[PDB]
Protein backbone atom coordinates (compact mmCIF):
# COMPACT_ATOMS: atom_id res chain seq x y z
CA UNK A 1 0.00 0.00 0.00
CA UNK A 2 2.67 2.48 1.08
CA UNK A 3 6.11 1.03 0.30
CA UNK A 4 8.42 1.59 3.23
CA UNK A 5 12.12 2.13 3.58
CA UNK A 6 14.06 -1.18 3.74
CA UNK A 7 15.28 -2.18 7.20
CA UNK A 8 18.90 -1.11 6.63
CA UNK A 9 17.76 2.43 5.84
CA UNK A 10 15.42 2.64 8.84
CA UNK A 11 18.29 1.59 11.10
CA UNK A 12 20.69 4.12 9.59
CA UNK A 13 18.23 7.00 9.79
CA UNK A 14 17.45 6.17 13.42
CA UNK A 15 21.18 5.71 14.23
CA UNK A 16 22.03 9.02 12.57
CA UNK A 17 19.38 10.84 14.64
CA UNK A 18 17.31 11.99 11.65
CA UNK A 19 14.23 10.02 12.68
CA UNK A 20 13.00 10.73 16.19
CA UNK A 21 10.11 9.16 18.10
CA UNK A 22 7.48 11.96 18.05
CA UNK A 23 4.32 12.36 15.98
CA UNK A 24 3.26 15.80 14.66
CA UNK A 25 0.74 16.37 17.46
CA UNK A 26 3.31 15.56 20.15
CA UNK A 27 5.82 17.89 18.51
CA UNK A 28 3.33 20.76 18.52
CA UNK A 29 2.40 20.04 22.15
CA UNK A 30 6.09 20.19 23.11
CA UNK A 31 6.59 23.51 21.32
CA UNK A 32 3.43 24.94 22.85
CA UNK A 33 4.68 24.04 26.33
CA UNK A 34 7.84 26.11 25.81
CA UNK A 35 5.89 29.32 25.00
CA UNK A 36 2.23 28.81 25.89
CA UNK A 37 1.06 32.43 25.87
CA UNK A 38 2.98 33.60 22.78
CA UNK A 39 0.92 34.15 19.62
CA UNK A 40 1.36 31.19 17.28
CA UNK A 41 -1.07 32.03 14.51
CA UNK A 42 -2.86 35.15 13.36
CA UNK A 43 -5.20 36.32 10.64
CA UNK A 44 -6.86 39.71 10.13
CA UNK A 45 -8.92 39.49 13.30
CA UNK A 46 -7.97 36.40 15.27
CA UNK A 47 -4.71 35.83 17.14
CA UNK A 48 -4.16 32.49 18.88
CA UNK A 49 -1.59 31.72 21.54
CA UNK A 50 0.21 28.38 21.47
CA UNK A 51 -1.86 27.19 24.41
CA UNK A 52 -5.17 28.21 22.85
CA UNK A 53 -4.19 26.67 19.54
CA UNK A 54 -3.30 23.40 21.26
CA UNK A 55 -6.55 23.40 23.22
CA UNK A 56 -8.60 24.20 20.11
CA UNK A 57 -6.87 21.32 18.27
CA UNK A 58 -7.61 18.91 21.14
CA UNK A 59 -11.27 19.95 21.30
CA UNK A 60 -11.66 19.61 17.55
CA UNK A 61 -10.01 16.20 17.71
CA UNK A 62 -12.61 15.13 20.25
CA UNK A 63 -15.40 16.45 18.05
CA UNK A 64 -14.07 14.71 14.95
CA UNK A 65 -13.80 11.45 16.88
CA UNK A 66 -17.41 11.90 17.98
CA UNK A 67 -18.38 12.51 14.32
CA UNK A 68 -16.89 9.11 13.50
CA UNK A 69 -13.29 9.71 12.41
CA UNK A 70 -11.12 6.85 13.65
CA UNK A 71 -7.43 6.06 13.76
CA UNK A 72 -6.36 5.00 10.30
CA UNK A 73 -9.19 6.77 8.45
CA UNK A 74 -8.41 9.25 5.68
CA UNK A 75 -10.06 12.59 4.87
CA UNK A 76 -9.70 15.02 2.01
CA UNK A 77 -8.72 18.38 3.51
CA UNK A 78 -9.61 21.22 1.12
CA UNK A 79 -9.39 24.50 2.98
CA UNK A 80 -8.19 27.98 2.10
CA UNK A 81 -5.25 29.36 4.01
CA UNK A 82 -6.38 30.12 7.51
CA UNK A 83 -6.49 29.18 11.15
CA UNK A 84 -8.99 26.35 10.52
CA UNK A 85 -6.50 24.66 8.20
CA UNK A 86 -3.88 24.46 10.95
CA UNK A 87 -6.34 23.39 13.65
CA UNK A 88 -7.88 20.72 11.46
CA UNK A 89 -4.51 19.34 10.35
CA UNK A 90 -3.21 18.93 13.90
CA UNK A 91 -6.53 17.57 15.19
CA UNK A 92 -6.36 14.88 12.50
CA UNK A 93 -2.69 14.21 13.33
CA UNK A 94 -3.70 13.72 16.97
CA UNK A 95 -6.35 11.19 15.96
CA UNK A 96 -4.11 9.33 13.55
CA UNK A 97 -6.47 10.31 10.71
CA UNK A 98 -4.58 11.05 7.50
CA UNK A 99 -5.48 14.19 5.48
CA UNK A 100 -5.05 14.38 1.76
CA UNK A 101 -3.70 17.91 1.39
CA UNK A 102 -5.71 19.24 -1.54
CA UNK A 103 -4.88 22.62 -3.01
CA UNK A 104 -7.33 25.51 -3.05
CA UNK A 105 -7.22 25.44 -6.85
CA UNK A 106 -8.33 21.81 -6.99
CA UNK A 107 -11.88 21.17 -8.24
CA UNK A 108 -14.36 18.29 -8.60
CA UNK A 109 -12.20 16.15 -10.91
CA UNK A 110 -9.31 16.13 -8.43
CA UNK A 111 -11.34 16.15 -5.20
CA UNK A 112 -13.55 13.25 -6.29
CA UNK A 113 -10.47 11.31 -7.37
CA UNK A 114 -8.79 11.87 -4.01
CA UNK A 115 -11.87 10.88 -2.02
CA UNK A 116 -12.32 7.70 -4.02
CA UNK A 117 -8.65 6.72 -4.27
CA UNK A 118 -8.11 7.18 -0.51
CA UNK A 119 -11.55 5.79 0.51
CA UNK A 120 -11.95 9.01 2.46
CA UNK A 121 -14.46 9.02 5.29
CA UNK A 122 -14.88 12.79 5.03
CA UNK A 123 -14.39 15.81 2.84
CA UNK A 124 -13.50 18.85 4.95
CA UNK A 125 -13.94 22.16 3.22
CA UNK A 126 -15.18 25.75 3.47
CA UNK A 127 -18.12 27.84 2.35
CA UNK A 128 -15.81 29.34 -0.29
CA UNK A 129 -12.27 28.52 -1.47
CA UNK A 130 -10.11 30.16 -4.13
CA UNK A 131 -13.15 31.99 -5.52
CA UNK A 132 -15.08 28.72 -5.84
CA UNK A 133 -18.22 27.54 -4.01
CA UNK A 134 -17.42 23.88 -3.22
CA UNK A 135 -20.75 23.10 -1.61
CA UNK A 136 -22.53 21.76 -4.71
CA UNK A 137 -19.46 19.58 -5.33
CA UNK A 138 -19.53 18.36 -1.72
CA UNK A 139 -23.20 17.39 -2.00
CA UNK A 140 -22.39 15.41 -5.14
CA UNK A 141 -19.52 13.70 -3.32
CA UNK A 142 -22.06 12.51 -0.78
CA UNK A 143 -24.76 11.60 -3.29
CA UNK A 144 -22.33 9.57 -5.40
CA UNK A 145 -20.73 7.83 -2.39
CA UNK A 146 -17.29 9.35 -2.86
CA UNK A 147 -17.18 10.02 0.90
CA UNK A 148 -19.46 9.38 3.85
CA UNK A 149 -19.62 12.88 5.32
CA UNK A 150 -18.81 16.43 4.30
CA UNK A 151 -17.82 18.96 6.95
CA UNK A 152 -17.92 22.65 5.99
CA UNK A 153 -16.31 25.54 7.84
CA UNK A 154 -18.92 28.27 7.38
CA UNK A 155 -22.50 28.27 6.22
CA UNK A 156 -23.94 25.21 4.51
CA UNK A 157 -27.15 23.28 4.01
CA UNK A 158 -27.99 19.65 4.68
CA UNK A 159 -26.77 17.08 3.85
CA UNK A 160 -23.49 18.92 4.46
CA UNK A 161 -22.40 19.19 8.09
CA UNK A 162 -21.00 22.07 10.11
CA UNK A 163 -17.36 21.94 11.25
CA UNK A 164 -17.43 24.80 13.78
CA UNK A 165 -19.67 23.07 16.38
CA UNK A 166 -17.18 20.21 16.74
CA UNK A 167 -14.83 22.62 18.58
CA UNK A 168 -17.20 22.53 21.56
CA UNK A 169 -16.19 19.02 22.60
CA UNK A 170 -14.12 18.36 25.71
CA UNK A 171 -10.42 18.44 24.93
CA UNK A 172 -8.96 15.10 23.95
CA UNK A 173 -5.62 14.66 25.70
CA UNK A 174 -4.41 11.39 24.18
CA UNK A 175 -2.60 10.96 20.87
CA UNK A 176 -3.24 7.83 18.78
CA UNK A 177 -0.50 8.28 16.17
CA UNK A 178 2.87 6.50 16.08
CA UNK A 179 6.00 8.21 14.76
CA UNK A 180 6.37 5.54 12.07
CA UNK A 181 2.75 5.97 10.85
CA UNK A 182 1.66 7.75 7.70
CA UNK A 183 0.73 11.25 8.87
CA UNK A 184 -0.74 12.71 5.71
CA UNK A 185 -0.89 12.33 1.96
CA UNK A 186 0.94 15.05 0.09
CA UNK A 187 0.15 15.44 -3.60
CA UNK A 188 2.42 15.14 -6.60
CA UNK A 189 3.03 18.27 -8.60
CA UNK A 190 3.73 16.88 -12.02
CA UNK A 191 2.28 18.00 -15.32
CA UNK A 192 -0.09 15.06 -15.92
CA UNK A 193 -2.65 14.98 -13.08
CA UNK A 194 -4.73 13.73 -11.32
CA UNK A 195 -2.12 14.25 -8.61
CA UNK A 196 -0.80 11.12 -6.96
CA UNK A 197 -0.99 10.54 -3.21
CA UNK A 198 2.37 10.79 -1.45
CA UNK A 199 2.46 9.07 1.96
CA UNK A 200 4.52 11.14 4.37
CA UNK A 201 5.27 9.57 7.75
CA UNK A 202 5.52 11.54 11.01
CA UNK A 203 9.16 10.86 11.79
CA UNK A 204 10.57 11.53 8.31
CA UNK A 205 8.39 14.54 7.59
CA UNK A 206 9.34 16.01 10.98
CA UNK A 207 13.01 15.47 10.06
CA UNK A 208 12.28 17.43 6.87
CA UNK A 209 10.82 20.22 9.01
CA UNK A 210 13.54 20.30 11.66
CA UNK A 211 16.45 20.14 9.23
CA UNK A 212 14.88 22.79 6.99
CA UNK A 213 14.27 25.05 9.99
CA UNK A 214 17.95 24.82 10.96
CA UNK A 215 19.18 25.55 7.42
CA UNK A 216 16.80 28.52 7.06
CA UNK A 217 17.61 30.07 10.45
CA UNK A 218 14.09 29.80 11.92
CA UNK A 219 13.90 30.75 15.59
CA UNK A 220 11.59 32.21 18.21
CA UNK A 221 11.45 35.56 16.41
CA UNK A 222 10.50 34.15 12.98
CA UNK A 223 7.26 35.70 11.66
CA UNK A 224 6.28 33.58 8.64
CA UNK A 225 3.84 34.79 5.99
CA UNK A 226 1.99 32.13 3.98
CA UNK A 227 2.65 33.38 0.44
CA UNK A 228 1.63 30.03 -1.09
CA UNK A 229 -1.11 27.53 -0.24
CA UNK A 230 -0.58 26.03 3.21
CA UNK A 231 -1.40 22.53 1.90
CA UNK A 232 1.66 22.60 -0.33
CA UNK A 233 4.89 21.04 0.89
CA UNK A 234 6.94 24.27 0.48
CA UNK A 235 4.51 26.27 2.67
CA UNK A 236 3.76 23.50 5.12
CA UNK A 237 7.09 21.96 6.00
CA UNK A 238 10.09 23.51 4.23
CA UNK A 239 10.23 24.83 6.84
CA UNK A 240 6.86 26.46 6.35
CA UNK A 241 4.01 26.80 8.81
CA UNK A 242 4.92 23.71 10.79
CA UNK A 243 8.61 24.67 10.99
CA UNK A 244 7.59 28.09 12.32
CA UNK A 245 5.32 26.51 14.94
CA UNK A 246 7.97 24.04 16.03
CA UNK A 247 10.51 26.87 16.32
CA UNK A 248 7.98 28.76 18.44
CA UNK A 249 7.69 31.61 15.93
CA UNK A 250 4.47 33.14 14.62
CA UNK A 251 2.53 32.38 11.45
CA UNK A 252 0.70 35.12 9.58
CA UNK A 253 -2.04 33.72 7.35
CA UNK A 254 -2.79 35.20 3.96
CA UNK A 255 -5.06 33.93 1.19
CA UNK A 256 -3.48 36.26 -1.40
CA UNK A 257 0.03 36.68 -2.72
CA UNK A 258 -0.41 40.02 -4.51
CA UNK A 259 2.06 42.66 -3.25
CA UNK A 260 -0.64 45.26 -2.56
CA UNK A 261 -2.08 42.98 0.11
CA UNK A 262 1.07 41.23 1.25
CA UNK A 263 3.24 44.32 1.59
CA UNK A 264 0.66 45.93 3.90
CA UNK A 265 0.54 42.67 5.85
CA UNK A 266 4.34 42.55 6.12
CA UNK A 267 4.37 46.09 7.57
CA UNK A 268 1.46 45.46 9.96
CA UNK A 269 2.75 42.17 11.36
CA UNK A 270 6.52 42.75 10.94
CA UNK A 271 6.85 39.60 8.82
CA UNK A 272 10.40 38.26 8.59
CA UNK A 273 10.15 35.17 6.37
CA UNK A 274 8.10 33.94 3.41
CA UNK A 275 8.30 31.60 0.40
CA UNK A 276 7.14 32.18 -3.18
CA UNK A 277 7.30 30.70 -6.67
CA UNK A 278 9.15 32.80 -9.31
CA UNK A 279 6.03 34.32 -10.95
CA UNK A 280 4.91 35.71 -7.60
CA UNK A 281 8.43 36.91 -6.76
CA UNK A 282 8.38 38.80 -10.10
CA UNK A 283 5.19 40.55 -8.99
CA UNK A 284 6.85 41.59 -5.74
CA UNK A 285 9.97 42.85 -7.54
CA UNK A 286 7.88 44.88 -10.01
CA UNK A 287 5.47 46.28 -7.44
CA UNK A 288 5.12 49.96 -8.04
CA UNK A 289 3.37 52.21 -5.54
CA UNK A 290 2.97 49.23 -3.19
CA UNK A 291 6.71 49.35 -2.52
CA UNK A 292 6.05 52.43 -0.35
CA UNK A 293 5.28 49.84 2.33
CA UNK A 294 7.70 49.40 5.20
CA UNK A 295 9.36 46.08 4.31
CA UNK A 296 12.22 46.60 6.77
CA UNK A 297 11.23 43.58 8.87
CA UNK A 298 11.72 41.18 5.95
CA UNK A 299 14.79 38.97 6.48
CA UNK A 300 14.47 35.96 4.12
CA UNK A 301 12.61 35.25 0.87
CA UNK A 302 12.69 31.61 -0.24
CA UNK A 303 12.02 31.11 -3.94
CA UNK A 304 11.46 27.73 -5.53
CA UNK A 305 8.95 25.56 -7.36
CA UNK A 306 10.52 26.71 -10.59
CA UNK A 307 13.92 28.24 -11.23
CA UNK A 308 14.55 31.86 -10.31
CA UNK A 309 16.95 33.16 -12.94
CA UNK A 310 19.93 35.30 -12.01
CA UNK A 311 18.43 38.46 -13.55
CA UNK A 312 15.53 38.38 -11.11
CA UNK A 313 17.53 36.89 -8.22
CA UNK A 314 19.95 39.85 -8.27
CA UNK A 315 17.06 42.25 -7.63
CA UNK A 316 15.79 40.62 -4.41
CA UNK A 317 18.22 42.16 -1.92
CA UNK A 318 18.30 45.67 -3.48
CA UNK A 319 14.53 45.94 -3.99
CA UNK A 320 13.17 44.08 -0.95
CA UNK A 321 16.10 44.41 1.45
CA UNK A 322 16.09 40.75 2.48
CA UNK A 323 18.27 37.73 1.84
CA UNK A 324 17.35 35.34 -0.97
CA UNK A 325 17.35 31.57 -0.70
CA UNK A 326 16.83 29.40 -3.76
CA UNK A 327 15.19 26.05 -3.11
CA UNK A 328 14.70 22.99 -5.31
CA UNK A 329 12.06 20.78 -3.72
CA UNK A 330 9.47 18.13 -4.49
CA UNK A 331 6.54 16.78 -2.52
CA UNK A 332 8.04 13.30 -2.92
CA UNK A 333 11.10 14.22 -0.83
CA UNK A 334 14.42 15.84 -1.76
CA UNK A 335 14.92 19.50 -0.84
CA UNK A 336 18.02 21.43 -1.90
CA UNK A 337 18.78 24.82 -0.35
CA UNK A 338 21.27 27.59 -0.87
CA UNK A 339 22.69 28.47 2.52
CA UNK A 340 22.31 31.72 4.41
CA UNK A 341 26.07 32.33 4.32
CA UNK A 342 26.55 31.31 0.72
CA UNK A 343 28.21 33.72 -1.71
CA UNK A 344 26.32 35.32 -4.60
CA UNK A 345 27.77 32.82 -7.09
CA UNK A 346 25.63 30.13 -5.44
CA UNK A 347 22.58 32.15 -4.44
CA UNK A 348 22.03 33.78 -7.82
CA UNK A 349 22.92 30.80 -10.07
CA UNK A 350 22.01 27.54 -8.32
CA UNK A 351 19.06 25.89 -6.65
CA UNK A 352 20.95 24.69 -3.59
CA UNK A 353 22.58 21.59 -2.19
CA UNK A 354 20.74 18.65 -0.58
CA UNK A 355 19.17 19.17 2.83
CA UNK A 356 20.40 15.93 4.43
CA UNK A 357 23.90 14.44 4.49
CA UNK A 358 22.15 11.12 3.77
CA UNK A 359 20.43 12.37 0.59
CA UNK A 360 21.84 10.24 -2.24
CA UNK A 361 21.64 12.09 -5.56
CA UNK A 362 22.38 10.48 -8.93
CA UNK A 363 22.21 12.31 -12.25
CA UNK A 364 21.84 9.85 -15.13
CA UNK A 365 21.53 9.79 -18.89
CA UNK A 366 18.88 7.91 -20.86
CA UNK A 367 20.90 4.69 -20.53
CA UNK A 368 21.13 4.98 -16.72
CA UNK A 369 24.79 6.05 -16.86
CA UNK A 370 25.89 8.57 -14.27
CA UNK A 371 26.87 11.72 -16.20
CA UNK A 372 30.13 13.62 -15.79
CA UNK A 373 30.57 16.67 -13.62
CA UNK A 374 28.64 19.68 -14.84
CA UNK A 375 26.81 17.62 -17.48
CA UNK A 376 23.01 17.54 -17.57
CA UNK A 377 20.99 14.44 -16.84
CA UNK A 378 17.93 13.21 -15.01
CA UNK A 379 17.90 13.80 -11.27
CA UNK A 380 17.24 10.64 -9.26
CA UNK A 381 17.36 10.47 -5.49
CA UNK A 382 16.82 8.40 -2.39
CA UNK A 383 17.07 9.65 1.15
CA UNK A 384 15.66 9.93 4.66
CA UNK A 385 12.56 11.92 3.67
CA UNK A 386 12.09 10.75 0.04
CA UNK A 387 9.31 8.20 -0.52
CA UNK A 388 9.87 4.72 -1.93
CA UNK A 389 6.46 4.60 -3.62
CA UNK A 390 3.23 6.46 -4.06
CA UNK A 391 0.18 5.28 -2.13
CA UNK A 392 -1.57 2.20 -3.53
CA UNK A 393 0.21 2.68 -6.88
CA UNK A 394 2.29 -0.46 -7.51
CA UNK A 395 1.99 -0.32 -11.30
CA UNK A 396 3.10 3.28 -11.64
CA UNK A 397 5.66 2.78 -8.84
CA UNK A 398 7.36 0.05 -10.87
CA UNK A 399 8.26 2.73 -13.43
CA UNK A 400 8.80 5.75 -11.17
CA UNK A 401 11.40 4.18 -8.85
CA UNK A 402 14.55 2.30 -9.70
CA UNK A 403 15.24 -1.22 -8.51
CA UNK A 404 17.51 0.15 -5.79
CA UNK A 405 14.88 2.63 -4.60
CA UNK A 406 15.81 5.91 -6.29
CA UNK A 407 12.93 8.22 -7.22
CA UNK A 408 13.10 9.34 -10.86
CA UNK A 409 12.16 13.02 -10.65
CA UNK A 410 11.75 13.80 -14.31
CA UNK A 411 13.93 16.89 -13.79
CA UNK A 412 17.05 17.66 -15.77
CA UNK A 413 19.89 19.04 -13.65
CA UNK A 414 23.65 19.45 -13.46
CA UNK A 415 25.86 19.76 -10.36
CA UNK A 416 28.59 22.33 -9.79
CA UNK A 417 32.01 21.69 -8.24
CA UNK A 418 30.60 22.05 -4.71
CA UNK A 419 27.55 19.83 -5.18
CA UNK A 420 24.98 22.54 -5.85
CA UNK A 421 22.21 21.63 -8.27
CA UNK A 422 21.48 23.74 -11.36
CA UNK A 423 18.06 22.90 -12.76
CA UNK A 424 17.64 23.00 -16.52
CA UNK A 425 13.96 22.17 -16.32
CA UNK A 426 11.55 19.30 -16.71
CA UNK A 427 12.29 16.43 -19.08
CA UNK A 428 9.23 17.35 -21.16
CA UNK A 429 10.25 21.02 -21.43
CA UNK A 430 13.42 20.19 -23.40
CA UNK A 431 13.97 21.85 -26.77
CA UNK A 432 15.73 20.18 -29.73
CA UNK A 433 15.82 22.60 -32.67
CA UNK A 434 17.18 20.87 -35.76
CA UNK A 435 19.50 18.80 -33.61
CA UNK A 436 20.64 21.74 -31.47
CA UNK A 437 19.67 21.62 -27.79
CA UNK A 438 18.46 24.94 -26.36
CA UNK A 439 18.43 25.74 -22.63
CA UNK A 440 15.11 27.52 -22.23
CA UNK A 441 16.25 29.05 -18.94
CA UNK A 442 19.17 30.84 -20.65
CA UNK A 443 16.88 32.61 -23.11
CA UNK A 444 14.21 33.35 -20.49
CA UNK A 445 16.77 34.89 -18.10
CA UNK A 446 18.00 37.27 -20.79
CA UNK A 447 14.50 38.35 -21.72
CA UNK A 448 13.63 38.95 -18.06
CA UNK A 449 16.57 41.32 -17.78
CA UNK A 450 14.94 43.62 -20.35
CA UNK A 451 13.49 46.75 -18.65
CA UNK A 452 10.10 46.37 -20.40
CA UNK A 453 9.77 42.61 -19.82
CA UNK A 454 7.94 41.40 -16.74
CA UNK A 455 8.35 37.66 -17.30
CA UNK A 456 9.15 35.28 -20.14
CA UNK A 457 8.83 31.57 -20.88
CA UNK A 458 10.16 29.62 -23.88
CA UNK A 459 8.55 26.40 -25.18
CA UNK A 460 8.86 24.06 -28.14
CA UNK A 461 6.46 23.90 -31.06
CA UNK A 462 6.37 21.29 -33.82
CA UNK A 463 8.13 21.99 -37.08
CA UNK A 464 8.24 19.79 -40.17
CA UNK A 465 11.81 20.71 -41.16
CA UNK A 466 13.52 21.24 -37.79
CA UNK A 467 11.34 18.95 -35.68
CA UNK A 468 10.89 21.73 -33.13
CA UNK A 469 11.07 25.49 -33.28
CA UNK A 470 10.90 27.74 -30.24
CA UNK A 471 8.22 30.18 -29.09
CA UNK A 472 8.79 32.69 -26.28
CA UNK A 473 5.74 34.00 -24.47
CA UNK A 474 6.49 37.36 -22.90
CA UNK A 475 4.49 39.46 -20.44
CA UNK A 476 5.51 43.08 -21.12
CA UNK A 477 5.79 46.11 -18.94
CA UNK A 478 4.56 49.26 -20.63
CA UNK A 479 5.66 50.57 -23.01
CA UNK A 480 5.71 47.04 -24.39
CA UNK A 481 8.50 46.07 -26.83
CA UNK A 482 7.77 44.32 -30.11
CA UNK A 483 8.84 40.79 -31.00
CA UNK A 484 11.42 42.29 -33.38
CA UNK A 485 12.81 44.61 -30.70
CA UNK A 486 13.25 41.67 -28.32
CA UNK A 487 15.03 39.66 -31.03
CA UNK A 488 17.37 42.62 -31.60
CA UNK A 489 17.92 42.83 -27.84
CA UNK A 490 18.85 39.14 -27.62
CA UNK A 491 21.37 39.72 -30.42
CA UNK A 492 22.86 42.66 -28.51
CA UNK A 493 23.12 40.32 -25.50
CA UNK A 494 25.37 37.96 -27.47
CA UNK A 495 22.91 35.07 -27.66
CA UNK A 496 23.74 32.39 -30.19
CA UNK A 497 21.64 32.82 -33.32
CA UNK A 498 20.00 29.38 -33.14
CA UNK A 499 18.79 30.17 -29.59
CA UNK A 500 16.83 33.29 -30.59
CA UNK A 501 13.13 32.31 -30.43
CA UNK A 502 11.58 31.70 -33.83
CA UNK A 503 8.36 33.27 -32.55
CA UNK A 504 7.78 35.76 -29.74
CA UNK A 505 4.22 36.25 -28.43
CA UNK A 506 3.38 39.26 -26.27
CA UNK A 507 0.65 38.25 -23.80
CA UNK A 508 -0.86 39.63 -20.58
CA UNK A 509 -0.40 36.45 -18.54
CA UNK A 510 0.63 32.83 -18.61
CA UNK A 511 -1.47 29.78 -17.76
CA UNK A 512 -0.58 28.62 -14.26
CA UNK A 513 -0.52 25.49 -12.10
CA UNK A 514 -2.15 25.01 -8.71
CA UNK A 515 0.41 27.03 -6.71
CA UNK A 516 1.16 29.52 -9.50
CA UNK A 517 3.91 27.92 -11.57
CA UNK A 518 3.88 28.53 -15.34
CA UNK A 519 2.18 25.69 -17.24
CA UNK A 520 4.48 25.03 -20.19
CA UNK A 521 2.32 22.00 -21.04
CA UNK A 522 -0.67 24.31 -21.59
CA UNK A 523 1.39 26.65 -23.78
CA UNK A 524 2.59 23.75 -25.93
CA UNK A 525 -0.98 22.50 -26.37
CA UNK A 526 -2.05 26.01 -27.38
CA UNK A 527 0.62 26.02 -30.07
CA UNK A 528 0.01 22.44 -31.22
CA UNK A 529 -3.63 23.05 -32.08
CA UNK A 530 -2.69 26.29 -33.88
Ligand SMILES: N#Cc1ccc(C(=O)NS(=O)(=O)OC[C@H]2O[C@@H](n3cnc4c(N)ncnc43)[C@H](O)[C@@H]2O)c(O)c1
Pocket residue numbers: 187188189190233234238239303304305306307308326327328329330331332335351409410411423425426
Ligand atom coordinates in the same frame (compact mmCIF):
# COMPACT_ATOMS: atom_id res chain seq x y z
N1 LIG B 1 11.48 23.87 0.21
C1 LIG B 1 10.85 23.52 -0.62
C2 LIG B 1 10.00 23.09 -1.79
C3 LIG B 1 10.05 23.86 -2.94
C4 LIG B 1 9.31 23.51 -4.03
C5 LIG B 1 8.53 22.38 -3.94
C6 LIG B 1 7.72 21.98 -5.16
O1 LIG B 1 7.63 22.63 -6.13
N2 LIG B 1 7.11 20.70 -4.98
S1 LIG B 1 6.18 20.06 -6.21
O2 LIG B 1 5.86 18.65 -5.88
O3 LIG B 1 4.96 20.89 -6.40
O4 LIG B 1 7.01 20.18 -7.64
C7 LIG B 1 8.29 19.59 -7.73
C8 LIG B 1 8.82 19.92 -9.01
O5 LIG B 1 8.99 21.41 -9.17
C9 LIG B 1 10.11 21.60 -9.79
N3 LIG B 1 10.94 22.46 -8.98
C10 LIG B 1 10.78 22.71 -7.66
N4 LIG B 1 11.69 23.65 -7.30
C11 LIG B 1 12.38 24.01 -8.41
C12 LIG B 1 13.43 24.95 -8.65
N5 LIG B 1 13.95 25.76 -7.58
N6 LIG B 1 13.89 25.06 -9.87
C13 LIG B 1 13.41 24.32 -10.87
N7 LIG B 1 12.43 23.42 -10.71
C14 LIG B 1 11.92 23.27 -9.46
C15 LIG B 1 10.76 20.16 -10.14
O6 LIG B 1 10.25 19.90 -11.50
C16 LIG B 1 10.29 19.45 -9.21
O7 LIG B 1 10.23 18.00 -9.59
C17 LIG B 1 8.48 21.60 -2.78
O8 LIG B 1 7.70 20.44 -2.66
C18 LIG B 1 9.23 21.97 -1.70
